[PDB]
Amino acid sequence: WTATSGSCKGRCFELQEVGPPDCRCDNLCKSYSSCCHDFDELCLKTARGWECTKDRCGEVRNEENACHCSEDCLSRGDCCTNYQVVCKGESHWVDDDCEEIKVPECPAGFVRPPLIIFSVDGFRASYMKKGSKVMPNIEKLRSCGTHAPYMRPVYPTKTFPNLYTLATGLYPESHGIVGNSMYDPVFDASFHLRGREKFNHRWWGGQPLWITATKQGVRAGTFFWSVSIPHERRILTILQWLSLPDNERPSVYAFYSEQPDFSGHKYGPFGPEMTNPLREIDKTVGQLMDGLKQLRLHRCVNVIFVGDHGMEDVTCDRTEFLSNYLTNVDDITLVPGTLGRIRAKSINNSKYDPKTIIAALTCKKPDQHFKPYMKQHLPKRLHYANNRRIEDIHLLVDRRWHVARKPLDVYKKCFFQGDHGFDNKVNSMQTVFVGYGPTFKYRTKVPPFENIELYNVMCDLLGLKPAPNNGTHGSLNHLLRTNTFRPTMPDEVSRPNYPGIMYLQSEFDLGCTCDDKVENKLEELNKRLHTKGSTKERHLLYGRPAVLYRTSYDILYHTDFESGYSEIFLMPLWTSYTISKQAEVSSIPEHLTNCVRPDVRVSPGFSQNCLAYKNDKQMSYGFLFPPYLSSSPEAKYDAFLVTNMVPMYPAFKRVWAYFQRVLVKKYASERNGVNVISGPIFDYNYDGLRDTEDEIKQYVEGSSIPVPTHYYSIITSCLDFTQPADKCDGPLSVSSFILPHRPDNDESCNSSEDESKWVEELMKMHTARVRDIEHLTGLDFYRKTSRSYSEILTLKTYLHTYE
Template structure:
């Protein structure tokens, strides 16, 4: 790395060297496009290369001036003819309005598409402007789509230095606004403002940060000489000696719940919230520190720091669900709908939108193509539902096991159509992989039961505010033989004493339940009693009831997730069996999808409008060390875990191989928007 002090800015000139492709070696000064970044430009770089002498806008004194080739733009009478006017020339010197927004309205191009014989292919070429030659003939100039990208280091630089709430940040924001105004006015001056698509997007937000709000790992007994810390708003630890043997679990344990006011949570990468999709790669560090908002992490405090000498008041890189990490997206041009607002979306969706604007077919990516069609005037891509791979098998009642425990209750036959309408108001989840499963239909819930896993892939039920609910419990000591059996009740699976049953269904009418129904339709094995007794019970007893009371009616879908290789995708049956060995397979996570109608006082069965969804992917680990609370009062710390492990429905689909919301009252593109939406709970902070 070259020391910046080696450069001598006076050692040379940029005359005749502007934007040279080879960077000059020190002590000579540079004139390439990166010299500003490395503070190595010659003294006359701005004057010679950026041509800043005349500024970038006309003034009243410059209107009608003689042409000056040393200026970046002209205000002379011939500038329109030569195409090098400053962006405000027409408005200032000719008295024409430069307000782009005042002339923006819905419109339709009236000219004909480019004919093939002209050498312009409609698929790849974009019409820019029509020129009327006669009453019946139009000439259209066609050009290949180009992408011009401009990046500004502001307001990021001053955001770090001053903080996001500083009044002094107004000035760089005004400068950015002025630059965008110059761009739009220039497009209008060239009559291109209705022909060019413009996207304005930020790469991240900014949060308050300060030297006095910093955690030091040396305070936690970590041997700082053995590790490298990527410090800041999202800490990552790696050993300095890559060949050294160390136990990341031990390091995480030593950094977990050690201080009464600890401002970070330590995670193994496989335990990070699934919504982050940041685990399965050797380049990703084993140990991660998720920081509280406004707090940073460093290895050790600096020596002899002078009070008041902090040089930064803002930072980014915190958990991206935090509202201060959100940024801006604006789209303007002929391809975008007029005055349309879309729900917040993740930046992984931008690639597909850009491909749509350019008429390109996107390669496979992490986005959901079509989920942002609502912002486009004529979307070139129309998404379709994926085809179901495996349909449910019909149950052979003759081979169905009978209960050996009589609960003294009976089940009346219910109309299956009514059951589906009640508990599957948005369609049955489709299985997108080869499997063997059947539907278990009951008056209070419906399950998609897997013969191979001996547990449901999904269980769904609808709750109403008027129904009386109670949580049903079933322990391993009361588990009948049928809960351990296979398709015909003969294939027994060994069960460790360390696992117990977890019920996916909150009991609504216990008198109608049969023990075979319980074991086959709504339970999954659990190896953490604390998860079952505290987290899962709280979800059923408190969370679901709360959402039911708030929304009058909710539909709930729950089920298991197996992601032992933590790649964010569904484990195959072979992987699940390989990891479980001879024992019963135990899920790595459980998912919960809660849906309600956007309209007030409307049940999910009656909903004919938009839907709202909240999803969780809850980790299933041997202990609850993720929370530092040992209190029996679960309302605080379980809610915190739920907020942390919020997720998109699309995340659940990737981890289960299921496709949800197959039949909704909304267009399919709006359903995709629903699937890619993530409830952040930031309004609760």
């Protein structure tokens, strides 16, 4: 109910929100059907347009105008943005040569450079270069300011998840907005595009920048704008707010443009009709910067030009129908489009089974344009599982396609040529970032980064303390002239033991055998040194990983590799080794195929045993340091230590063996040596975080040996590849993966073929950031380099995309 009898007189775009049933005058009253009767007349004026013409110059003030050209308008903060250019012989901001902003130049009474977020829906990264001829204002921002070639959105690459991620620094699984459409089973409520449920506070998690600001005494303009408010009016409203007295004036503002998303959907990402939407956006940027100039704020304000996601070519005829795969089509609810989420249509149907749904969807057609997953099996880099609003069954749809339930859903609901939502590593989904102002660097290009990092930086720009978030604070310091935040490495929580030889062979009853009884001060003094860590500088290049939680573990040294061995999990947390470009691959000798050897540094009670793998018909074992890369026949025996062994399904050993036998050598060849750190991951509750001992859901049968959900590797070398990985003087280069440890290769449709045709493609899909592995393991890598900690944080957030 709205008693619309009240007035907007003197309240146009008020900053506080008056509660019902009094009428509103804010930038969202239209969306609520709650504006006062006079909102349009007073607050949405349009008379005479948005620009001064010659003959309006020093006119008599006429309150009915949209904006003014009268002499008092700089006083009232309501001149047309082009006022000074037409009436006072000033030039447009874009026509001025750009000049470094070494220090903020703010008018008296400004405590801090204001922040203006200029957000553009569906602004694909390549528009910066491809449309640069028709966007001179945006091109000046970009080339004079700080820019990335692209910014990575979050999955799914839809609007609500990405704008709320921008605002909170959180993954959608933590902020709760996991799609533009959602069902919450606990609430028993649906979130939609059309309607009033989306306004309910319970949907929105974390703490967006406007709440962070407000709680720490920094005032914010209102971020959201009703679609019917024209872009010019949005710009003039922001400019008017910027002339409020010091005690009332917000310090952070947002503008939002529906374009180029709106036209990109109808015309496709590069349709000829896309030029005008881009000209129009530029013109708006131009109005803003002209407006800031008249206010003498153009060298005081920090401006962020930022997109939510890109746009891909997608038409009706590229739709896959679930009704071509499932017999029980009407038993399911599908959330459709550029991603698929599936649940049971009725909760009272116990003849519903995810396993048979998945199996009917799995490599069923030669050219299949979507791949089904249980949500916990999705690539960890998507972080898209830990929320009840995310359905257990998920379809990753190929770029350029839709998935729908039945054909009648498409033609009774082509209308469109563009869409988005796909995997956030897809090139067409990338978006833009430009930062311009006293706090950003001058003419600086920074590497691509993820939009989850931005909340931290916007907090820094405003002197705020960020709420806990998924950004890595420090990783974007190289974007900033000043206001850097100077992080310190976390403290190690557990210190390792350094076991010596403590146990005789015969104390072990592990059911393991090895043909190793074949055996000198020459080569025995030598090997005692290796077990004490004489070659550790070779294999442990960036310090030992720090264990950041309370546990009991041993460092074990070997000729070819070093490991941190957990007495809790009966296996290493990490194994480190360096493969030089000269290193040669060997095979496992015939007599050593089944060889496993007790480790006399580690008690029998804290070792695995071969009996367990014998009795477990589903489970085999692999090794973390690969025997193929051993440096000598004698060194090879170290690779067969029971303390280098890990449980692996046979199906996964196909993947792991090809990685260790073929790909490590190939990376070392290409990168001029590589350092590898490999290990197990336990994330049974799919929250992206290390599981504690009492959360383990699966053991090798009849043992206390826990079964990893994933295996990771981090592969580091020198960024200047003319330098070997073990003698690198400068920046480092990294790629990582987090491979799911599954009992079949159903994910890989070509898996019956040779590993050379499918394994590297799997690994590429499961590419990961070192930071992702840190959360999953409780480990902290790169503790001892000669690089700055900020540079190290950036390296740790890097994702190698292969696109």
